[PDB]
Amino acid sequence: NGVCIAYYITDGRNPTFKLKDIPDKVDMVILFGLKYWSLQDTTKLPGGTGMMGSFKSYKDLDTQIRSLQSRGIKVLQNIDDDVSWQSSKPGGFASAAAYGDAIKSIVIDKWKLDGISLDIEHSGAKPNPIPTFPGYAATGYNGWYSGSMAATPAFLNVISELTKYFGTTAPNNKQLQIASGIDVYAWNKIMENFRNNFNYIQLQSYGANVSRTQLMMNYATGTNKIPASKMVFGAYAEGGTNQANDVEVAKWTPTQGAKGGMMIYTYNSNVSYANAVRDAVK
């Protein structure tokens, strides 16, 4: 009985399925598409347009978030890694600490959200040297995803600071999750430093079958030393074609033991598909 984490992409797709319509048996919802700077300054992106396409206004967004929270559903904000994370001025702020304070201020202090999920896969400087990727048998991936970036000290500093406000060692039960892949350059170092801080570690195993997710588990647990209970696999509801496999993975218990659960990308993209995966994991 793992967790069921729902991504709700805020681009206005399937508009009749509102954020507040997330059904029961869904533990958390991650606002995706919408950017943290929009939460920071609500005047730049008009409601009902772009990444606010799913809401009539910011008041509508705010009201719907509370509807979910009062039902006991945790609402998290997605935050993408960025090349500025490899710089001394992450997110334009003066330091990683300033950046950390800023995210806490916007996500927690202002919007009263339950945490953040880091989508780690964006471009930036690659590691030097580039290690030889372990390969498919060892990880469930063929090689490096060349569009990702190195977890340089500056990059790790950002996550370290976020760790003071989000995650297992931070106060006020705030979620800190990561959505990435073993094929992302930054993966290994992120895990060496913060695996224990993440409540959940999501693998973007979209379209995988149990065999493949098990290869991932072997590595995540054995080599990255990640507790099996934090592992969450990705159900690509948006694709609408891998439901049977996703359901198998949802009900599946890795050889390493009970996994954390499943995340659905995106719940609002295909509700029937999402409901099926939710049912399977619950």
UniProtKB/Swiss-Prot annotation:
Instruction: Please describe what this protein does.
Output: Endohydrolysis of the di-N-acetylchitobiosyl unit in high-mannose glycopeptides and glycoproteins. Hydrolyzes bi- and triantennary glycans. The presence of a core-bound fucose greatly augments endo F3 activity on biantennary and, presumably, triantennary oligosaccharides.
The record's listing under SUPFAM superfamilies reads: (Trans)glycosidases
Source organism per UniProt: Elizabethkingia meningoseptica
Q: What is this protein called?
A: Endo-beta-N-acetylglucosaminidase F3
Q: How is it modified after translation?
A: Carbohydrate at Thr-42 consists of (2-OMe)Man1-4GlcNAcU1-4GlcU1-4Glc1-4(2-OMe)GlcU1-4[(2-OMe)Rham1-2]Man.
- Chief location bin: secreted
Indicate the quaternary assembly: Monomer.
Q: What is its EC number?
A: 3.2.1.96
Q: Which residues form the active site?
A: E121 (proton donor)
* Residue positions with a glycan: T42
Record field: catalytic activity: an N(4)-(oligosaccharide-(1->3)-[oligosaccharide-(1->6)]-beta-D-Man-(1->4)-beta-D-GlcNAc-(1->4)-alpha-D-GlcNAc)-L-asparaginyl-[protein] + H2O = an oligosaccharide-(1->3)-[oligosaccharide-(1->6)]-beta-D-Man-(1->4)-D-GlcNAc + N(4)-(N-acetyl-beta-D-glucosaminyl)-L-asparaginyl-[protein]
